[PDB]
Ligand binder design. Structure first.
Ligand SMILES: *[C@@H]1O[C@H](CO)[C@@H](O[C@@H]2O[C@H](CO)[C@@H](O)[C@H](O)[C@H]2NC(C)=O)[C@H](O)[C@H]1NC(C)=O
Ligand SMILES: NCCc1c[nH]c2ccc(O)cc12
Ligand SMILES: NCCc1c[nH]c2ccc(O)cc12
Ligand SMILES: NCCc1c[nH]c2ccc(O)cc12
Ligand SMILES: NCCc1c[nH]c2ccc(O)cc12
Ligand SMILES: NCCc1c[nH]c2ccc(O)cc12
Lengths: 391, 391, 391, 391, 391
């Protein structure tokens, strides 16, 4: 003749009358507090300006109608009832691309003082700002908010329930060996108002996401230095052979088709410009001026219709090397004619030989100038790595 | 012995009887007003003729059955009740590709005068018209409507509640650094009727979306001028060497394979034709006539079976340069035979030399003509940029 | 003391008892009529044999239990009640790949005679037959049906409510500047029966969809004629130079890699064969026989181990051109030896010159034959365009 | 004063009490019968080991609580009631990748004997085994089951209601001109038990799916024979010209890049190996040995540092062709010196000519051997087609 | 006058009062046990750090309110009631990317002792850790948990109901011929607590997934050895011909474009580095040094401006081969001049011949050194296969 714990349950849930806002006085606003912790973060998308994450969520509010004494009710401090019976205030996240899918988990906590608690899992894919001005080391300053969509300041109040330093520095749960890592989150309470006499409660959390370069750094540094060092190899073969310019245009077309297929994949943005992309344009212009001096050296060496060398080429090159390091009479007539033809042919051959020599000398000089250019390239890389190492 | 605010709630919600249209007289139509503001806009698709956006939505109507005095009911002006109990008129958006996903947020406002309000978030992906006749600077004149699907003029009335200038010029909420930016929206109220005596209420909002070129302008202007300037480099090597035409067909195949892989990605439409695409066809025809004059210069220079030069080539070129800038007798017989063979060989060599010279002269002339063509290309680009800068 | 319009509502909805089929006599079948209009059509898929569309839907039936007089009930002819209370017969569409998503719009019309109406939006993505035998101008004869899934002939009757000519010719709502355009729809009422004594009602609508070629016609006609006309350019350079066959295999590999990447995209079918695809195979075989005659002309000209020309080559070519357009004695001995060597060398040179000449003559002849082949190609294109212009 | 047909309806549905298993005796198991017919089959996926289909489904069971006489109840044999009120046993399909989407169609049949029927449409995408050992002609032996997930043998009994031959041979509904065609389905009733005293009812249907080669057979046979016959063309040009090996490596790289891009698309599997894929490896090795003999013939012909021919090359080749088909004395001294130099040069030229001749002879022989290899290739193709034609 | 089995059903379900936690004493926690078996596993994704699987799930708990005697209640031991009426505790899986879709199957078991059972199918796609340090043979140590989200230790208790060895070794159901195979699962019960006095129950199952290499092993080993053995073929042609370096850069560009398109597909990770990828970089550097020695041999052989050979090249090579294996006077003057010119020309020709000889000797030596390098490559492959065969 003694009922179970459900006696208190149907004593409370007899006339709860959900759908009305539970207050003793309507002027006093109820308080629902916010708390968010980030369990994990999934992949982002730079095309859609969007990112995915999985955070654990918890909140509580004062229900104000559930009052019972701990004595003579079999010492009951807390119990479990479904969330469909209890009035639940709406805490809505903005800038979402779709509604977050989640299990129902229809259970909430209660307390004898009237405080009710709700622990729910909710994940969100949301669109916010991001920059790619430094793509290996980006700040990724995104924001996600928790506001009341339908209600005002005067009825719903949002607090923290924790110290802001404890929320700011919390690394209890986070999955490692991922591409992205957070260091801190930042709570902020600002009031939101579009027009006069309509101010709504808003709680904003700022996340800072650090991407770690381990794999894409090697995958970006390897093919550029690879094709540059095979270009350094491919300068060495002599220029009067015609396969050098075909080699270099083969290398140029290969670097072009590789540069097109890789620039759309990893910095896949519509508006932002990476710092590495202009560096690629500098590499393209450097390959272009290399092709231009190759064309010039190929043009400078030829064997047909070459005249005498100008004396300013001869005077400068010798200064460059020192700072660098009847049956008897008729037959004689025709034999002199044959000698004249052979002498003209050998004279043309010696002129072509001298043009080949001065072309070889200028080719060696311009190769050493390009080596100094590669040294400046390496100094730029070392300075960039030293700045990012100092941080 | 004094109840809470729920006394007014179950005084109102005792016999509300949802599902019937609440009027005192059925001839008088109720008024539901429209209001829309655009928080953000996501990406579009040119293939599916569709676009995505996220707008904040709000509306109100007269419920006509909820009447209570502010005096003696504890000064209650407004309160919150779920939207499932209240009759909600259907405001449906057309030309949608799927139903818009959204949270339920089951709460509405009421007032003592009978006016009820509903604030709901709804996003929409909808299919409308777009043109690509100017792809960097497009108008993007799309339309999205708010009509009553099931009801008529005579029962549901749609108004604005705001000035049309205030709706037309409103930039309170919009996310920056995106690819698309709106400048104004345009409200319009037109009646919709398919047959006789059936007119339905329709409210149409016209959006104008301006795309900003920052990244794709550089990404479209850089490779075309890049391959044209490396072609300008690649004209310089002499034509009698056979690697020039191989260089040019390598450049042509590279430009072709690049032009195919990039034309399907960014102007990804099935019907519309961009203005930049015909410009690409002009570039292809210009590269074709460059390849044609290259083939002509390669054909014009040869060393085997070349006859005497025609005098119209010789007369025109000298005018072009000035406006441009027994044991004793038998041995003599065989020696004369050897002289005859050597003289014939040297005569053929001199003829081939003259053909090489006139080919070189015509090659220089046609190169300068192509330089004038590049100047006309640049004048066209400067005129186009000047028109788009004047706007 | 006078109630509102809800008095008639709860006079009707007191004991409606949904879920039972409303008839006075069970032998008499109720009639639900069909009507469909096509607002818009979205993209199709040739891979999945499927297509998407958005049609406006409407239907009505006799509810037979709602009877009230217009007099003394405040002149009420029609009113609105939710569709969840009213028995709704199932009109199901077949050959669907998934359930169509749509808003609930839970409202229906009633009338005092008992006729109830329901206006609902429903879109459908459905799988049906299509052919690509003429891919620019296809018929696209698809079918979509409206049958009763669960009920029979004897209980549910399907009529039209409109003239079949008015349904057949109706262009009130359709979006323009799309890839697809319909000209007519065709209603048809056929009985459906799998076994004996089980006949079900079926209403079938046949849609005919005309695709308009504006963009893909240019995008398909431009690169083929482009590579053919650059081949016409590339025949001109002399064949004894070795870069001609490298040019032609470069063009052949480029046309092959372009033909592979474009044939999988636009005619993306698993079974059907387009008429344009065999035309591409004819183009490939024509490029192959061009490469074959190029290889033959390259083989026919050589300078080492060439014998005397056969007289059938010499007799045919001269007919082709006319219809086309001691110290004194020993030194003499060794000098005669040197003369013998030089005479042998010049004889071999003259033989190689004659082989070069006859190769050049045959090359010009075969080039003119290929020009006649291009004329036959153009006649085929003009005949095809004339047939499709006559229609 | 005479009610409608709903009198029998609320006589039956007063105390039906859904959720309890309807039996008069709990020891007697109720029988729910199975029946499945395949309306259509959609595409499959070889990567995800999964396939899609659309089957029509029907089943019935004995409800045992609905008993009414046909007399004095207005001759009612059958009527329609919603499926939410009637107890529905769970018939669940296994190896599904997601829950099948379907309309609710909430209506079932009843009968006066107590037999209730349910006709529902359900489509399924399910993962099962498949093999690609013969990819044009595969068996595709997949299985799909209908078991009771929650209940046992002792309460739910599964029968057929039709002859197994009539289920095995049924072609009433199937869409033609698709890639896949079934010839028969196979019913099988096996008991399923994991541990002792827990046996569950399982009904398994085995489907056999025949793929028809019309388009991909041509699309697979055309490019291989295409590149082989253009290789047959490309053997013909002389080997001492250097463009032959460049031609052949161009063809080899083109065939390699085509073979990579096509082998990942159509036989897109992770584990299974097709028979056509090893055939492609045989083609690659054949192209490799062709490139190897090409390199050997290019190496065998050279003009610098060639010694005398070995006599085993000279003896074998002549057997191969027959079975195949003071001022007076000093000037004489220097003239003899010039004769010595010219004689040495002509001797070296004749040696190089003989090496060119024997290289040409061996090239013709190896070309005819490769022609015999192409004949063996064709015999293999004819034998394969003859076996698949005999079947 | 004797009711059916539903008498016990509405004797039990009269006042069950769902939503309250059923206990006689609130201090005593109820026990819900866990059990999981893996029916099948679908594909994984290395990009999203996620994997898909389909497991069969079962659990039971003590309901504590359903008590009835087997005698006089018609011998009823167990019966079936819907799961919506019975209180169901929440067992939630973490690190999920979306909610798992599943049928409702709303039926549970009961027993006369009070024990209720629930058999439900649930599949899950979840994100966990994985490594690619050995991509053909990986451990794939993933974890999936079963915790109570809302409740504590003090109210919900999780046990096993089976021996841990029987759970660890269970291969009753698993689909074969897949890419992945499990060998064991590992249960573990650890307590989960974020702050003080809040400890929650957690049950963790560790799965170990072994991937089998059959197809991708051949698909990865075949093209690398293929291009290396065609490089071994392509070393053989003489280096003074210019097509060798064009051949090798054609092979290098083909291997580069193949290496780029295949490295993004199969090891598609953002952070992890495979062991095969560095092996590919070693192959690229080996091809680079092969191209470098090819460029060196091409540079070493030339015919213009070659001086006398240095004696250290001549002394080392002869040691390398042995360990390896008036009208009368004027005409005489001009004839001596012609002899001087011919002697100079022949001297230059002999010097160029000697340079060609020493280049050929060094080329053969470096080819044999590269053959020893290929032997070291093969020894590395054999050692790797021997280690993975020993395991
Ligand atoms: C599209 O196909 C349907 C059938 O697939 C055609 O319908 C036929 O129409 C003729 C005359 O209207 C009837 O005699 C046939 O019985 C119909 N066939 C069937 C199976 O019902 C329809 O005519 C086709 N449309 C066009 C434009 O040709
Ligand atoms: N802060 C809740 C969003 C919000 C503020 N003002 C609003 C006005 C209209 C609307 O739909 C939404 C809002
Ligand atoms: N304005 C609501 C659309 C509309 C107007 N007339 C209609 C007729 C039928 C239908 O399904 C829809 C409509
Ligand atoms: N409206 C066609 C319904 C239909 C006809 N025969 C059928 C057989 C089985 C089934 O589930 C459904 C059907
Ligand atoms: N035959 C229904 C599947 C099945 C058999 N035994 C089972 C045990 C547990 C479970 O969840 C499912 C099953
Ligand atoms: N083990 C249940 C998850 C859990 C433990 N502590 C929590 C705190 C907050 C929260 O949202 C979730 C949790």
């Amino acid at each position: 003749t003694q009922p179970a714990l459900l006696r208190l349950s149907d004593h409370l849930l007899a006339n709860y009358k959900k759908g009305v806002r539970p207050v003793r006085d309507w002027r006093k606003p109820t308080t629902v507090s916010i708390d968010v912790i980030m369990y994990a973060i999934l992949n982002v998308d730079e095309k859609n300006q969007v990112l995915t994450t999985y955070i654990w969520y918890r909140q509580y509010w004062t229900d104000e109608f559930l009052q019972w004494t701990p004595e003579d009710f079999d010492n009951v401090t807390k119990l479990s009832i479904p969330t469909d019976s209890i009035w639940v205030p709406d805490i809505l996240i903005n800038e979402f691309v779709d509604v977050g899918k989640s299990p129902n988990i229809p259970y909430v906590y209660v307390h004898h003082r009237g405080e009710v608690q709700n622990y729910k899992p909710l994940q969100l894919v949301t669109a916010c700002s991001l920059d790619i001005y430094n793509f290996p080391f980006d700040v990724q300053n995104c924001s996600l908010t928790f506001t009341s969509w339908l209600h005002t300041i005067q009825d719903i109040n949002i607090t923290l329930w924790r110290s802001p330093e404890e929320v700011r520095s919390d690394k209890s749960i986070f999955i490692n060996q991922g591409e992205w890592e957070l260091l801190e989150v930042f709570p902020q309470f600002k009031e939101f108002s579009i027009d006069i006499s309509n101010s709504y409660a808003e709680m904003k959390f700022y996340v800072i996401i650090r991407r770690r370069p381990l794999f894409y750094a090697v995958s970006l540094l390897l093919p550029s230095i690879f094709l540059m060092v095979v270009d350094i190899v491919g300068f060495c073969l002599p220029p009067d052979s015609g396969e050098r310019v075909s080699f270099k245009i083969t290398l140029l077309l290969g670097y072009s088709v590789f540069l097109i297929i890789v620039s759309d994949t990893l910095p896949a943005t519509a508006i932002g410009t990476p710092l590495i992309g202009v560096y690629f344009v500098v590499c393209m212009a450097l390959l272009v001026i290399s092709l231009a001096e190759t064309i010039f050296i190929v043009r400078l060496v030829h064997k047909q219709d070459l005249q005498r060398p100008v004396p300013d080429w001869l005077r400068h090159l010798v200064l460059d090397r020192i700072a660098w390091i009847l049956a008897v009479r008729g037959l004689l007539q025709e034999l002199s004619s044959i000698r004249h033809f052979l002498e003209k042919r050998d004279e043309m051959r010696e002129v072509a030989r001298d043009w080949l020599r001065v072309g070889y000398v200028l080719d060696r000089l311009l190769f050493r100038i390009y080596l100094l250019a590669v040294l400046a390239y390496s100094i730029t890389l070392v300075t960039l790595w030293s700045i990012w190492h100092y941080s």
